[PDB]
Structures are given as structure tokens and as C-alpha cells.
């Protein structure tokens, strides 16, 4: 027996994603490739954010990712910021940004 995640070479759960599509009732039927495609996309997005968040953790000399690192990774990337525009990351804080007219 080979799990559908292992058959697609993915770490994300294809079987669970399939069930969650079927029991959203989002449609009457769900194709066999739809959960595989969706799982791969979710995995890709998580990898991107985690990669960028781990870099932010290393640049603050930390070995564990915290919400601050996730906020730094998302707001410092034009595409991730645009995707997560109407999102609030709890305990994420803000980018350091001061308007030039206010400076010394």
C-alpha cells in the first residue's frame, strides 16, 4: 500500500484534503487530481513562508520561529503581503517605519 501523499511525493495530506473538499459540499463531486493539486499548492506556500521566517529567525540570532518572524517574512515580501493584505498576525507587531519629515 502507498499513501496518496507518498504517491504524489508530498508531505501534506492528500486523503485529508480530499475529505475536507468532499464535506465542504463545495461541489457534488471531487476529481482524483484536485486534492493532490490543492495539497501541493498548500505545501508550496507553507514552505515559502517557513523558509523566509527561518531566515528572519536566524537574522535575530533565534533558533525557533515566533509570530514576529512570520510577520517580518510576510510584510517584507510584496507578493506575500498582497496575498495576506487583510490579515492580522497576532503578536506579529509592525515593520519599523518612520516618515522622513519626523526624523532629526
Amino acid at each position: 500500500a502507498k499513501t496518496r501523499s507518498s504517491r504524489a511525493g508530498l508531505q501534506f495530506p492528500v486523503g485529508r484534503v480530499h475529505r475536507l473538499l468532499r464535506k465542504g459540499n463545495y461541489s457534488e463531486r471531487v476529481g482524483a487530481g484536485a486534492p493532490v493539486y490543492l495539497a501541493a499548492v498548500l505545501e508550496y506556500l507553507t514552505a515559502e513562508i517557513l523558509e523566509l521566517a527561518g531566515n528572519a529567525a536566524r537574522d535575530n540570532k533565534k533558533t525557533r520561529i515566533i509570530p514576529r518572524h512570520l510577520q517580518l517574512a510576510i510584510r517584507n515580501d510584496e507578493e506575500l503581503n498582497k496575498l495576506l493584505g487583510r490579515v492580522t498576525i497576532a503578536q506579529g507587531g509592525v515593520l519599523p517605519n518612520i516618515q522622513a519629515v519626523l526624523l532629526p
Binding site: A90, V94, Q99
Partner: protein
Amino acid sequence: NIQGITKPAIRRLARRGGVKRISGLIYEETRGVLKVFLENVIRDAVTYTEHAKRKTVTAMDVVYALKRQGRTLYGFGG
């Protein structure tokens, strides 16, 4: 209870927003717009609670209320 949102707290929020100089009339104005925002979120959160026949507002009720007002919050089960 709205006075519990003190001037120093409103200055701290403004400082995180990058504001250097604040007029004295801003504190009362901020208390107003905070009250409106809270009322709108709490109203919807309580509606979800009543629909669930619960007597306790849950974090999920708040998350749903924020989501439907276009202020999605991550970190409370999202």
C-alpha cells in the same frame, strides 16, 4: 470603562503607528472610533454565540465576526 483606555495607552498605539506629535483632542476621538469598532465586532460575536445557544462568547465567535468584517485574525484557530 472607556476612560480605562488612558492617554499613555493611546500615545503607545500612535507611537507604533509612527506618530511623533499628537493633538490633545485625539484621545477623545480615538476612544470614540475604538468604541464603534468594538461594538460592531462584539455585536456579531454575540450573534454567533446566541445561534450556538451558548452563554459564553468563544474565541471562535470573535474570529468569525472579524472574518466577516474583513479583518481576518490569525493565531486563535483561524
